[PDB]
Design a protein around this ligand. Structure first.
Ligand SMILES: CCCCCCCCCCCCCCCC(=O)OC[C@H](COP(=O)(O)O)OC(=O)CCCCCCCCCCCCCCC
Ligand SMILES: CCCCCCCCCCCCCCCC(=O)O
Ligand SMILES: CCCCCCCCCCCCCCCC(=O)O
Ligand SMILES: CCCCCCCCCC
Lengths: 385, 385
């Protein structure tokens, strides 16, 4: 839709790039030599463009490498089996059919391995190449020059797709990974404040994005290993793994925010009157946590190093003030008459679960800070000021 | 390989049925009327089998319908553009390429939409068909006649694939969803027992399987609405949705088990000598919860209605006993010296969060019992023996 396009103009550029590659191949085939067989080999290029044009440069390179491997191995095996069939002069079609059965069984069995559920697209091209070459080289024989001519057009289609994708506003998966790591910090910072305000009032996509994106940041890292150097990422081997290490460190913290959100939806809840006693300390703790997470996101975005001052001083002081406040008024959580109604006791005891989950969230930040200090060292981040 | 076959005879029969379909289409192509010039586009029949075989019957029917939609629509559009092109006799290649650019841009933009992301297979067929039938039907007036031949060989291949798939050893998605619900019930019971036993020592994939299976439980439901009646499920409109409703009540219960597992990996913990005071009540609560979950799983598996007895009496009584015990020994959770070391106070206050989360887990089971009764009435479950 128009709103979708205006919000993200990257997709419009990608669509116009694919349409331009198809237009170029079409123009060549329209104004090509009028040699015979034109309508036969013309379509192969325009149809491999639609198959090899991927969103990112690294996915294009990886998928075209696995597709070239599958096609070359299937064609070599098909030619070897076609030559071997001649020995069974009396039984030719029987041998060819039994080879098609064995190959189909083996490829279909190997694609089902748990460790190969990602590379099915190369097993399909393997089975297609073997069946096409075995069935299109029988009624005539000596089916070679044509299988060596079809690939000189598949190559042209892939060459024009690669040139158009790479040399006109390319999209790099490394920058996608960098911007996703920057986004997660702001999502978690918004969720924490939303949870505290919701509990103290007289938040889902935030931690959902940080918890549900583990595989996205691994596929982006798989694609980024093929791309050459560019921009600020100038090095033989950029440490892309420290980004995923810092993302895991942040996810370990986002699980506590998930538990704090789940406290609001519980069936058992504490009286609103007793919540207002501890309002100030909870608001200060949430404010300092959101400030620290936005500072770390801003320092990751600019590729800057940490300053000399301690970043955790204020949040630690706030958490110690909250602990003292809980200590002074603990008599509102339990009762002393029975010391030696179940619902009322559970409601009273459920406020200390919120306070303990907030103290544990403050306790888990040091690991994210250490991960950032490691990433700013492996990658030569700039000094501040 | 051998282990994946002996432990799963499904994946052997599937590969053998693919090989059988390929060898029947092959035998047909090979043994043909002496005149081979009657047809030369015979690989179109063998390449459809490799593209329209799926694990389940409902997936095959749904995907075949979505592929024939795009193919017929693209062929009609291409023939309309070809007929309208002859008006501009002077410029034919320019109009054709201006049509290809627009079609590629619209198909890519429409396939990048987030909502229509499960239908990416049907958007490539449209563009491929348009380009093939516009570049191949150039300088020819009988391409309309060619088209029908190509689709008659694609129809022969799809008919053979559907017959072989549906008449040898059908694999139904309805049974897959039915088995998945029972497996999630057993996983959640095992996780609850493991966490309660782990906290008292002198579990991980269980709740994870139940929490992350929503996409599978929705795709299987989408496939299951195409399949005809068979076996136990004998009705035109089987309430497959009530299974998803019960699985979502179970997910809402599993989130508390995840929060209980998070208490074992925390930086702040309570001394064991204080944990051992409440061992019996926690152990009884966990035993009763796991017995209730396994009873509901066993009644879902057998397709039987609930008896006249009350299922929740025992666990409710165990929870009441736990609450009374917490009331009696509450002086071990707070300190009365300062009523009016921070770490030791937090460690003491962290023991009550585990018990409050266990009480919330016990409180959330009534929704699951109500959803089970709703599914037991919507689908006619047999009365207990
Ligand atoms: C083969 C060289 C290029 C590489 C191909 C990529 C291989 C990787 C695997 C992907 C799938 C196989 C490749 C497919 C390539 C291909 O050529 O495939 C192009 C398509 C099939 O594409 P798919 O293989 O993706 O399904 O072929 C056709 O559809 C042509 C059939 C003729 C259309 C006639 C329609 C009849 C309509 C009658 C008129 C009435 C209309 C009424 C309207 C109202
Ligand atoms: C989806 C169908 C795609 C087309 C599949 C057939 C293409 C044939 C291309 C042959 C590739 C080259 C094989 C070389 C084998 C060799 O020389 O040993
Ligand atoms: C020669 C390259 C392409 C060969 C044909 C590949 C298979 C094309 C399948 C198109 C989708 C047809 C699925 C529906 C068929 C039907 O409804 O019977
Ligand atoms: C249709 C599959 C094409 C496989 C080749 C991919 C591009 C590399 C050509 C050398």
């Amino acid at each position: 839709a128009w709103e979708m396009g205006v919000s993200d103009p990257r997709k419009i550029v990608f669509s116009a790039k694919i349409g331009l590659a198809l237009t170029i191949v079409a123009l060549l085939i329209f104004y090509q030599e009028p040699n015979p067989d034109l309508s036969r080999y013309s379509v192969w290029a325009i149809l491999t463009v639609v198959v090899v044009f991927e969103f990112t440069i690294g996915a294009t390179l990886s998928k075209g490498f696995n597709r070239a491997l599958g096609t070359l191995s299937a064609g070599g095996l098909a030619l070897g089996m076609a030559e071997l069939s001649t020995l069974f002069g009396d039984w030719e079609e029987i041998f060819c059919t039994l080879s098609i059965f064995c190959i189909g069984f083996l490829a279909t069995f190997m694609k089902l391995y748990p460790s190969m559920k990602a590379y099915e697209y190369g097993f399909r091209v393997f089975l297609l190449t073997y069946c096409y070459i075995l069935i299109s080289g029988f009624r005539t024989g000596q089916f070679i020059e044509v299988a060596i001519s079809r690939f000189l057009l598949i190559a042209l289609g892939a060459g024009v797709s690669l040139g158009v994708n790479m040399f006109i506003y390319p999209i790099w998966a490394g920058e996608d990974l960098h911007n996703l790591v920057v986004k997660n910090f702001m999502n978690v910072a918004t969720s924490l404040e939303g949870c505290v305000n919701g509990y103290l009032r007289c938040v889902y996509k935030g931690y959902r994005s940080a918890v549900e994106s583990t595989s996205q940041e691994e596929s982006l890292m798989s694609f980024a290993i093929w791309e050459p150097p560019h921009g600020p990422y100038k090095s033989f081997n950029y440490p892309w793994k420290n980004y995923v290490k810092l993302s895991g460190a942040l996810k370990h913290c986002a699980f506590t925010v998930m538990a704090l959100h789940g406290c609001i939806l519980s069936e058992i809840q504490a009286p609103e009157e007793r919540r207002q006693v501890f309002r100030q300390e909870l608001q200060r703790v949430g404010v300092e946590g959101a400030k620290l997470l936005r500072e770390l996101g801003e320092k990751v975005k600019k590729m800057e190093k940490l300053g000399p001052v301690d970043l955790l001083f204020e949040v630690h002081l706030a958490a110690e003030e909250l602990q003292h406040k809980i200590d002074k008024k603990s008599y509102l959580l339990v009762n002393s008459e029975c010391w030696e109604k179940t619902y009322e006791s559970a409601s009273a005891l459920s406020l200390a679960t919120f306070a303990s989950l907030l103290i544990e969230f403050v306790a888990r930040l040091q690991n994210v800070v250490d991960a950032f200090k490691e990433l700013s060292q492996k990658a030569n981040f700039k000094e501040p000021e």
